Amino acid sequence: MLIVPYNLPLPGGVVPRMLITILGTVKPNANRIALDFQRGNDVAFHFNPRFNENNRRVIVCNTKLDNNWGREERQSVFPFESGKPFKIQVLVEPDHFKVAVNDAHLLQYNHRVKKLNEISKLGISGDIDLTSASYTMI
């Protein structure tokens, strides 16, 4: 269905009540997935499942400003599985991005980049077969 890396334009940026839905399948022996919500060259929200970081599975979230990564945010819960279909839902809330995988809440990421309506691209990359990527307002 879609070629990765995939660019989803976010016209006029993001805003509370915007829900982004990504459907795909993790490839066999995947190493990484990444969602990059971009404000120009900056990455407002990087969401990065790592399947083998020192033989552990962890999701790393961060922000990139002026080509410099900030302080990462990690939590322990890893709902992805190599070879299996997934759904990622990213709901923009007034103070954070809220992420659910396979209909279960995963994490929140507080807004570091304040100019939400300039976060105008979502890049989708890594070791997936990407089926679809879209948004709606709830």
Side-chain angles (χ1 to χ4, degrees):
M1 223 79 58
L2 301 181
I3 285 275
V4 146
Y6 185 81
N7 178 73
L8 178 65
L10 308 174
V14 306
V15 70
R17 302 194 80 72
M18 201 167 162
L19 176 68
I20 297 93
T21 301
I22 298 96
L23 289 155
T25 299
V26 182
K27 287 172 178 216
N29 297 104
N31 179 68
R32 67 183 297 274
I33 298 167
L35 310 186
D36 285 286
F37 289 86
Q38 304 251 192
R39 175 172 174 259
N41 189 61
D42 281 358
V43 180
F45 177 40
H46 176 77
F47 175 88
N48 176 213
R50 294 185 191 181
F51 288 76
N52 182 16
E53 190 192 63
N54 301 134
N55 303 130
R56 320 232 179 141
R57 307 193 303 168
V58 60
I59 298 174
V60 177
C61 298
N62 206 353
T63 287
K64 197 188 193 192
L65 300 175
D66 293 342
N67 246 26
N68 303 318
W69 285 110
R71 188 173 65 180
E72 294 177 349
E73 302 193 27
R74 311 154 162 254
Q75 51 73 63
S76 64
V77 175
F78 196 94
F80 302 95
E81 286 296 334
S82 298
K84 299 200 195 185
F86 63 89
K87 179 173 71 181
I88 308 169
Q89 287 162 313
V90 183
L91 180 54
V92 185
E93 295 200 320
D95 286 340
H96 44 262
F97 295 95
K98 184 167 79 190
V99 180
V101 178
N102 303 341
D103 290 319
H105 177 69
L106 179 62
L107 62 79
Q108 290 175 186
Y109 186 88
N110 289 340
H111 295 126
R112 307 189 189 171
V113 172
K114 302 298 165 181
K115 287 181 198 164
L116 300 185
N117 69 5
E118 299 185 358
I119 305 173
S120 301
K121 281 174 201 282
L122 169 61
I124 304 171
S125 67
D127 302 327
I128 65 174
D129 295 332
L130 178 62
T131 301
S132 66
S134 69
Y135 47 76
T136 190
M137 306 285 302
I138 63 156

Coordinates of all heavy atoms in Angstrom, one line a residue, residues 19-95:
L19 N -6.5 13.6 15.3 CA -6.2 12.3 15.5 C -5.5 11.7 14.3 O -6.1 11.7 13.3 CB -7.4 11.5 15.9 CG -7.2 10.0 16.1 CD1 -6.4 9.7 17.3 CD2 -8.5 9.2 16.2
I20 N -4.3 11.2 14.4 CA -3.5 10.6 13.3 C -3.6 9.1 13.5 O -3.2 8.7 14.6 CB -2.1 11.2 13.3 CG1 -2.1 12.7 13.0 CG2 -1.3 10.5 12.2 CD1 -2.0 13.5 14.3
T21 N -3.9 8.4 12.5 CA -3.9 6.9 12.5 C -3.0 6.3 11.5 O -3.1 6.7 10.3 CB -5.4 6.4 12.3 OG1 -6.2 7.0 13.2 CG2 -5.4 4.9 12.3
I22 N -2.1 5.4 11.9 CA -1.2 4.7 11.1 C -1.4 3.3 11.3 O -1.5 2.7 12.3 CB 0.3 5.0 11.6 CG1 0.7 6.5 11.6 CG2 1.3 4.2 10.9 CD1 0.6 7.3 12.9
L23 N -1.6 2.6 10.1 CA -1.8 1.2 10.1 C -0.7 0.6 9.3 O -0.3 1.0 8.2 CB -3.1 0.8 9.4 CG -4.4 1.1 10.2 CD1 -5.5 1.4 9.3 CD2 -4.6 0.1 11.3
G24 N -0.1 -0.5 9.8 CA 0.9 -1.2 9.0 C 1.2 -2.6 9.7 O 0.5 -3.0 10.6
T25 N 2.3 -3.2 9.3 CA 2.8 -4.5 9.8 C 4.2 -4.4 10.1 O 5.0 -3.9 9.2 CB 2.4 -5.6 8.9 OG1 1.0 -5.7 8.7 CG2 2.9 -7.0 9.4
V26 N 4.7 -4.8 11.2 CA 6.1 -4.8 11.5 C 6.8 -5.9 10.7 O 6.3 -7.0 10.6 CB 6.4 -5.0 13.0 CG1 7.9 -4.9 13.2 CG2 5.7 -3.9 13.8
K27 N 7.9 -5.6 10.0 CA 8.6 -6.6 9.2 C 9.2 -7.6 10.1 O 9.5 -7.4 11.3 CB 9.6 -6.0 8.3 CG 9.1 -5.2 7.1 CD 10.1 -4.5 6.4 CE 9.5 -3.7 5.2 NZ 10.4 -3.7 4.0
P28 N 9.5 -8.8 9.6 CA 10.3 -9.8 10.3 C 11.7 -9.2 10.6 O 12.4 -8.6 9.8 CB 10.4 -11.0 9.3 CG 9.2 -10.8 8.4 CD 9.0 -9.3 8.3
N29 N 12.1 -9.5 11.8 CA 13.4 -9.0 12.3 C 13.6 -7.5 12.1 O 14.7 -7.0 12.0 CB 14.6 -9.7 11.6 CG 14.6 -11.2 12.0 OD1 14.2 -12.0 11.2 ND2 15.0 -11.5 13.2
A30 N 12.5 -6.7 12.2 CA 12.6 -5.3 12.3 C 13.6 -4.9 13.4 O 13.8 -5.5 14.4 CB 11.3 -4.7 12.7
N31 N 14.3 -3.7 13.1 CA 15.2 -3.1 14.0 C 14.6 -1.8 14.6 O 14.7 -1.5 15.8 CB 16.5 -2.7 13.3 CG 17.4 -2.0 14.2 OD1 17.9 -2.6 15.2 ND2 17.6 -0.7 14.0
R32 N 13.9 -1.0 13.8 CA 13.3 0.3 14.3 C 12.1 0.7 13.5 O 11.9 0.3 12.4 CB 14.4 1.4 14.3 CG 14.8 1.7 12.8 CD 15.9 2.7 12.7 NE 15.6 4.0 13.3 CZ 15.0 5.0 12.6 NH1 14.6 4.9 11.4 NH2 14.9 6.2 13.2
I33 N 11.3 1.5 14.2 CA 10.2 2.3 13.5 C 10.4 3.7 13.9 O 10.9 4.0 15.0 CB 8.9 1.8 14.0 CG1 8.7 0.3 13.6 CG2 7.8 2.7 13.5 CD1 7.5 -0.3 14.3
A34 N 10.0 4.7 13.1 CA 10.1 6.1 13.5 C 8.9 6.9 13.0 O 8.6 6.8 11.8 CB 11.3 6.8 13.2
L35 N 8.3 7.6 13.8 CA 7.3 8.7 13.4 C 8.0 10.0 13.8 O 8.6 10.2 14.9 CB 6.0 8.6 14.2 CG 5.2 7.4 14.2 CD1 3.9 7.7 14.9 CD2 5.0 6.7 12.8
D36 N 8.1 10.9 12.9 CA 8.7 12.2 13.0 C 7.8 13.3 12.7 O 7.5 13.6 11.5 CB 10.0 12.3 12.1 CG 11.2 11.5 12.7 OD1 11.8 11.9 13.6 OD2 11.4 10.4 12.1
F37 N 7.2 14.0 13.7 CA 6.4 15.2 13.5 C 7.3 16.4 13.3 O 8.0 16.7 14.3 CB 5.4 15.3 14.6 CG 4.3 14.3 14.7 CD1 4.5 13.1 15.3 CD2 3.1 14.6 14.1 CE1 3.4 12.2 15.4 CE2 2.0 13.7 14.2 CZ 2.2 12.5 14.8
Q38 N 7.3 17.0 12.1 CA 8.3 18.0 11.8 C 7.7 19.4 11.7 O 6.7 19.6 11.2 CB 8.9 17.7 10.4 CG 9.5 16.3 10.3 CD 11.0 16.2 10.2 OE1 11.3 15.1 9.8 NE2 11.8 17.2 10.5
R39 N 8.5 20.3 12.2 CA 8.4 21.7 12.1 C 9.6 22.2 11.3 O 10.6 22.5 11.8 CB 8.3 22.5 13.4 CG 8.2 24.0 13.3 CD 7.9 24.6 14.6 NE 8.0 26.1 14.4 CZ 9.1 26.8 14.7 NH1 10.1 26.4 15.4 NH2 9.0 28.1 14.4
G40 N 9.5 22.3 10.0 CA 10.6 22.5 9.1 C 11.7 21.4 9.4 O 11.3 20.2 9.4
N41 N 12.9 21.8 9.6 CA 14.0 20.8 9.9 C 13.9 20.4 11.4 O 14.5 19.4 11.7 CB 15.3 21.5 9.7 CG 16.5 20.5 9.8 OD1 16.5 19.5 9.1 ND2 17.3 20.7 10.8
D42 N 13.1 21.0 12.2 CA 13.0 20.5 13.6 C 12.1 19.4 13.7 O 11.1 19.2 12.9 CB 12.5 21.7 14.5 CG 13.6 22.6 14.8 OD1 14.8 22.4 14.5 OD2 13.3 23.6 15.6
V43 N 12.3 18.5 14.7 CA 11.4 17.4 14.9 C 10.7 17.7 16.2 O 11.3 17.6 17.3 CB 12.1 16.0 14.9 CG1 11.1 14.9 15.2 CG2 12.8 15.8 13.6
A44 N 9.4 18.0 16.2 CA 8.7 18.3 17.4 C 8.5 17.1 18.2 O 8.5 17.2 19.5 CB 7.4 19.0 17.0
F45 N 8.2 16.0 17.6 CA 7.9 14.7 18.3 C 8.4 13.6 17.4 O 7.9 13.4 16.3 CB 6.4 14.6 18.6 CG 6.0 13.3 19.3 CD1 6.7 12.7 20.2 CD2 4.8 12.7 18.9 CE1 6.3 11.5 20.8 CE2 4.3 11.5 19.5 CZ 5.1 10.9 20.5
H46 N 9.4 12.9 17.9 CA 10.0 11.7 17.4 C 9.6 10.6 18.3 O 9.9 10.6 19.5 CB 11.6 11.8 17.4 CG 12.4 10.7 17.0 ND1 12.6 10.4 15.7 CD2 13.2 9.9 17.7 CE1 13.4 9.3 15.7 NE2 13.8 9.0 16.9
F47 N 8.9 9.6 17.7 CA 8.5 8.4 18.3 C 9.2 7.2 17.7 O 8.9 6.9 16.5 CB 6.9 8.3 18.2 CG 6.3 7.1 18.7 CD1 5.9 6.9 20.0 CD2 6.1 6.0 17.9 CE1 5.3 5.8 20.5 CE2 5.5 4.8 18.3 CZ 5.1 4.7 19.6
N48 N 10.0 6.5 18.5 CA 11.0 5.6 17.9 C 11.1 4.3 18.7 O 12.0 4.1 19.5 CB 12.4 6.3 17.9 CG 13.5 5.5 17.4 OD1 14.6 5.8 18.0 ND2 13.4 4.6 16.5
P49 N 10.3 3.3 18.3 CA 10.4 2.0 18.8 C 11.7 1.4 18.3 O 12.0 1.4 17.1 CB 9.2 1.2 18.2 CG 8.2 2.3 18.0 CD 9.0 3.5 17.6
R50 N 12.5 0.8 19.2 CA 13.8 0.2 19.0 C 13.7 -1.3 19.4 O 13.4 -1.5 20.6 CB 14.9 0.9 19.8 CG 15.1 2.3 19.3 CD 16.3 3.0 20.0 NE 16.3 4.4 19.6 CZ 17.3 5.2 20.1 NH1 18.2 4.8 20.9 NH2 17.2 6.5 19.7
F51 N 13.8 -2.2 18.4 CA 13.6 -3.6 18.7 C 14.8 -4.4 19.3 O 14.6 -5.5 19.8 CB 13.2 -4.3 17.4 CG 11.7 -3.9 17.0 CD1 11.5 -2.7 16.4 CD2 10.7 -4.8 17.2 CE1 10.2 -2.4 16.0 CE2 9.4 -4.5 16.9 CZ 9.1 -3.2 16.3
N52 N 15.9 -3.7 19.3 CA 17.1 -4.4 19.7 C 18.2 -3.3 20.1 O 19.2 -3.1 19.5 CB 17.7 -5.3 18.7 CG 18.9 -6.1 19.1 OD1 19.2 -6.1 20.2 ND2 19.7 -6.5 18.1
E53 N 17.9 -2.6 21.2 CA 18.8 -1.7 21.8 C 19.5 -2.5 22.9 O 18.9 -2.7 24.0 CB 18.2 -0.5 22.3 CG 19.3 0.6 22.7 CD 18.7 1.7 23.4 OE1 18.2 1.6 24.6 OE2 18.8 2.9 22.9
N54 N 20.7 -3.0 22.7 CA 21.4 -3.8 23.7 C 20.5 -5.0 24.1 O 20.3 -5.3 25.3 CB 21.8 -3.0 24.9 CG 22.7 -1.8 24.6 OD1 22.6 -0.7 25.0 ND2 23.8 -2.2 23.8
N55 N 19.8 -5.6 23.2 CA 19.0 -6.8 23.3 C 17.7 -6.5 24.2 O 17.2 -7.4 24.8 CB 19.7 -8.0 24.0 CG 20.9 -8.3 23.1 OD1 22.1 -8.4 23.5 ND2 20.7 -8.4 21.8
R56 N 17.3 -5.2 24.1 CA 16.0 -4.9 24.8 C 15.2 -4.1 23.8 O 15.7 -3.5 22.8 CB 16.4 -4.0 26.0 CG 17.6 -4.5 26.8 CD 17.1 -4.6 28.2 NE 18.0 -5.1 29.2 CZ 18.1 -4.7 30.5 NH1 17.4 -3.7 31.0 NH2 19.0 -5.3 31.3
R57 N 13.9 -4.1 24.0 CA 12.9 -3.4 23.2 C 12.5 -2.2 23.9 O 12.0 -2.3 25.1 CB 11.7 -4.4 22.9 CG 12.2 -5.7 22.3 CD 11.1 -6.4 21.7 NE 10.0 -6.7 22.7 CZ 8.8 -7.2 22.3 NH1 8.5 -7.4 21.0 NH2 7.9 -7.5 23.2
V58 N 12.6 -1.0 23.4 CA 12.2 0.2 24.1 C 11.8 1.2 23.1 O 12.1 1.2 21.9 CB 13.4 0.7 24.9 CG1 14.6 1.1 24.0 CG2 13.0 1.9 25.8
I59 N 10.9 2.1 23.6 CA 10.5 3.2 22.7 C 11.1 4.4 23.2 O 11.1 4.8 24.4 CB 9.0 3.3 22.7 CG1 8.4 2.0 22.1 CG2 8.5 4.5 22.0 CD1 6.9 1.9 22.2
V60 N 11.8 5.2 22.3 CA 12.4 6.4 22.6 C 11.6 7.5 22.0 O 11.3 7.5 20.8 CB 13.9 6.4 22.1 CG1 14.6 7.7 22.3 CG2 14.7 5.2 22.7
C61 N 11.4 8.6 22.7 CA 10.7 9.8 22.2 C 11.6 11.0 22.5 O 12.3 11.1 23.5 CB 9.4 10.0 22.9 SG 8.2 8.7 22.5
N62 N 11.6 11.9 21.6 CA 12.5 13.1 21.7 C 12.1 14.2 20.8 O 11.2 14.0 20.0 CB 14.0 12.7 21.5 CG 15.0 13.6 22.2 OD1 14.7 14.6 22.8 ND2 16.2 13.1 22.2
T63 N 12.8 15.3 20.8 CA 12.6 16.5 20.0 C 14.0 16.9 19.5 O 15.0 16.8 20.2 CB 12.0 17.6 20.9 OG1 10.7 17.4 21.1 CG2 12.1 19.0 20.2
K64 N 14.0 17.4 18.2 CA 15.3 17.8 17.6 C 15.1 19.3 17.3 O 14.2 19.7 16.5 CB 15.6 17.0 16.3 CG 17.0 17.1 15.8 CD 17.2 16.4 14.5 CE 18.5 16.2 13.9 NZ 18.4 15.7 12.5
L65 N 15.9 20.2 17.8 CA 15.9 21.6 17.6 C 17.2 22.1 17.1 O 18.3 21.8 17.6 CB 15.6 22.3 18.9 CG 14.3 22.0 19.6 CD1 14.3 22.7 21.0 CD2 13.1 22.3 18.8
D66 N 17.2 22.8 15.9 CA 18.5 23.3 15.3 C 19.5 22.1 15.2 O 20.7 22.3 15.4 CB 19.0 24.4 16.2 CG 18.1 25.6 16.1 OD1 17.3 25.8 15.2 OD2 18.3 26.5 17.0
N67 N 19.0 21.0 14.8 CA 19.8 19.8 14.5 C 20.4 19.2 15.8 O 21.2 18.3 15.7 CB 21.0 20.1 13.6 CG 20.9 19.4 12.2 OD1 19.8 19.1 11.7 ND2 22.1 19.2 11.6
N68 N 19.9 19.4 16.9 CA 20.3 18.8 18.2 C 19.2 18.1 18.9 O 18.1 18.7 19.1 CB 20.8 19.9 19.1 CG 21.9 20.8 18.6 OD1 22.8 20.3 18.0 ND2 21.8 22.1 18.9
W69 N 19.4 16.8 19.2 CA 18.4 16.1 19.9 C 18.5 16.5 21.4 O 19.6 16.7 21.9 CB 18.7 14.6 19.8 CG 18.4 14.0 18.4 CD1 19.2 13.6 17.5 CD2 17.0 13.8 17.9 NE1 18.5 13.1 16.4 CE2 17.1 13.2 16.6 CE3 15.8 14.0 18.4 CZ2 16.0 12.9 15.9 CZ3 14.7 13.6 17.7 CH2 14.8 13.1 16.4
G70 N 17.3 16.5 22.0 CA 17.1 16.9 23.4 C 17.3 15.7 24.3 O 17.8 14.7 24.0
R71 N 16.6 15.9 25.5 CA 16.7 14.8 26.5 C 15.6 13.8 26.2 O 14.4 14.2 26.2 CB 16.6 15.4 27.9 CG 16.8 14.5 29.0 CD 16.9 15.2 30.4 NE 15.6 15.8 30.7 CZ 15.3 16.5 31.8 NH1 16.1 16.8 32.8 NH2 14.0 17.0 31.8
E72 N 16.0 12.6 26.0 CA 15.0 11.6 25.6 C 14.1 11.2 26.7 O 14.5 11.3 27.9 CB 15.8 10.2 25.4 CG 16.7 10.2 24.2 CD 17.5 9.0 23.9 OE1 17.6 8.0 24.7 OE2 18.0 9.0 22.8
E73 N 12.9 10.7 26.3 CA 11.9 10.2 27.2 C 11.7 8.7 26.9 O 11.2 8.4 25.8 CB 10.6 10.9 27.1 CG 10.8 12.4 27.4 CD 9.4 13.1 27.6 OE1 8.4 12.5 28.0 OE2 9.4 14.4 27.3
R74 N 12.0 7.8 27.8 CA 11.7 6.4 27.7 C 10.8 5.9 28.8 O 10.9 6.3 30.0 CB 13.0 5.5 27.8 CG 14.1 6.0 26.9 CD 15.5 5.7 27.4 NE 16.5 5.8 26.2 CZ 17.0 4.8 25.6 NH1 16.8 3.5 25.8 NH2 17.9 5.1 24.6
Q75 N 10.0 4.9 28.5 CA 9.1 4.2 29.4 C 9.3 2.7 28.9 O 10.0 2.6 27.9 CB 7.7 4.6 29.5 CG 6.8 4.8 28.3 CD 6.4 3.5 27.6 OE1 5.7 2.8 28.3 NE2 6.8 3.2 26.4
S76 N 8.8 1.8 29.7 CA 9.2 0.4 29.5 C 8.3 -0.5 28.6 O 8.8 -1.6 28.3 CB 9.3 -0.3 30.9 OG 8.0 -0.4 31.5
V77 N 7.1 -0.1 28.3 CA 6.0 -0.8 27.7 C 6.3 -0.8 26.2 O 6.5 0.3 25.6 CB 4.6 -0.3 28.0 CG1 3.5 -1.0 27.2 CG2 4.3 -0.4 29.5
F78 N 6.2 -2.0 25.6 CA 6.5 -2.1 24.2 C 5.5 -3.0 23.5 O 5.6 -4.3 23.5 CB 7.9 -2.7 24.0 CG 8.5 -2.6 22.7 CD1 9.3 -1.6 22.2 CD2 8.3 -3.6 21.7 CE1 9.9 -1.5 21.0 CE2 8.8 -3.5 20.4 CZ 9.6 -2.4 20.1
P79 N 4.5 -2.5 22.9 CA 3.4 -3.3 22.3 C 3.6 -3.9 21.0 O 2.7 -4.7 20.6 CB 2.3 -2.2 22.3 CG 3.0 -0.9 22.0 CD 4.3 -1.0 22.8
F80 N 4.6 -3.5 20.2 CA 4.9 -4.0 18.9 C 5.5 -5.4 19.0 O 6.2 -5.7 19.9 CB 5.8 -3.0 18.2 CG 5.3 -1.6 18.0 CD1 5.6 -0.7 19.0 CD2 4.4 -1.3 17.0 CE1 5.1 0.6 18.8 CE2 3.8 0.0 17.0 CZ 4.2 0.9 17.9
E81 N 5.3 -6.1 17.9 CA 5.9 -7.4 17.7 C 6.3 -7.6 16.3 O 5.5 -7.4 15.4 CB 4.9 -8.6 18.1 CG 4.6 -8.8 19.5 CD 5.8 -9.3 20.4 OE1 6.7 -9.9 19.8 OE2 5.6 -9.0 21.6
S82 N 7.5 -8.1 16.1 CA 8.0 -8.4 14.7 C 7.0 -9.3 14.0 O 6.6 -10.3 14.6 CB 9.4 -8.9 14.7 OG 10.3 -8.0 15.3
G83 N 6.8 -8.9 12.8 CA 5.9 -9.7 11.9 C 4.4 -9.4 12.1 O 3.6 -9.9 11.3
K84 N 3.9 -8.6 13.0 CA 2.5 -8.5 13.3 C 2.0 -7.1 12.9 O 2.6 -6.1 13.0 CB 2.2 -8.7 14.8 CG 2.6 -10.0 15.4 CD 1.9 -10.3 16.7 CE 2.6 -11.5 17.4 NZ 1.8 -11.9 18.6
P85 N 0.7 -7.1 12.6 CA 0.0 -5.8 12.2 C -0.2 -5.0 13.5 O -0.5 -5.5 14.6 CB -1.3 -6.3 11.7 CG -1.5 -7.7 12.0 CD -0.1 -8.3 12.3
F86 N -0.2 -3.7 13.3 CA -0.3 -2.7 14.3 C -1.2 -1.5 13.8 O -1.3 -1.3 12.7 CB 1.0 -2.1 14.9 CG 1.8 -1.4 13.8 CD1 1.6 0.0 13.6 CD2 2.7 -2.0 13.0 CE1 2.2 0.7 12.6 CE2 3.4 -1.3 12.0 CZ 3.2 0.1 11.9
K87 N -1.7 -0.8 14.8 CA -2.4 0.5 14.6 C -1.7 1.4 15.6 O -1.7 1.1 16.8 CB -3.9 0.4 14.8 CG -4.6 1.7 14.7 CD -6.1 1.5 14.8 CE -6.6 1.2 16.1 NZ -8.1 1.0 16.1
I88 N -1.2 2.5 15.2 CA -0.8 3.6 16.0 C -1.8 4.8 15.9 O -2.0 5.2 14.7 CB 0.6 4.2 15.7 CG1 1.6 3.0 15.7 CG2 1.0 5.3 16.6 CD1 3.0 3.3 15.2
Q89 N -2.3 5.3 17.0 CA -3.1 6.5 17.0 C -2.4 7.5 17.8 O -2.0 7.3 19.0 CB -4.5 6.2 17.6 CG -5.4 5.3 16.7 CD -6.6 4.7 17.5 OE1 -6.4 4.0 18.5 NE2 -7.7 4.9 16.9
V90 N -2.2 8.7 17.3 CA -1.6 9.9 17.9 C -2.7 10.9 18.0 O -3.1 11.4 17.0 CB -0.4 10.4 17.2 CG1 0.2 11.5 18.0 CG2 0.6 9.3 17.0
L91 N -3.1 11.2 19.2 CA -4.1 12.2 19.5 C -3.4 13.5 20.0 O -2.7 13.4 21.0 CB -5.2 11.8 20.4 CG -6.3 12.7 20.8 CD1 -7.0 13.2 19.5 CD2 -7.4 12.0 21.6
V92 N -3.6 14.6 19.4 CA -3.1 15.8 19.8 C -4.0 16.4 20.9 O -5.2 16.6 20.7 CB -2.9 16.8 18.7 CG1 -2.2 18.1 19.2 CG2 -2.1 16.2 17.6
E93 N -3.5 16.6 22.1 CA -4.2 17.2 23.2 C -3.6 18.5 23.6 O -2.5 18.9 23.0 CB -4.3 16.2 24.4 CG -5.1 14.9 24.1 CD -5.6 14.0 25.1 OE1 -4.9 13.8 26.1 OE2 -6.8 13.5 25.0
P94 N -4.2 19.3 24.4 CA -3.6 20.7 24.5 C -2.2 20.8 25.1 O -1.5 21.7 24.9 CB -4.6 21.4 25.5 CG -5.9 20.6 25.1 CD -5.4 19.2 25.1
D95 N -1.8 19.8 25.9 CA -0.5 19.8 26.5 C 0.4 18.7 26.1 O 1.6 18.7 26.5 CB -0.6 19.8 28.1 CG -1.1 21.1 28.7 OD1 -1.0 22.1 28.1 OD2 -1.6 21.0 29.9

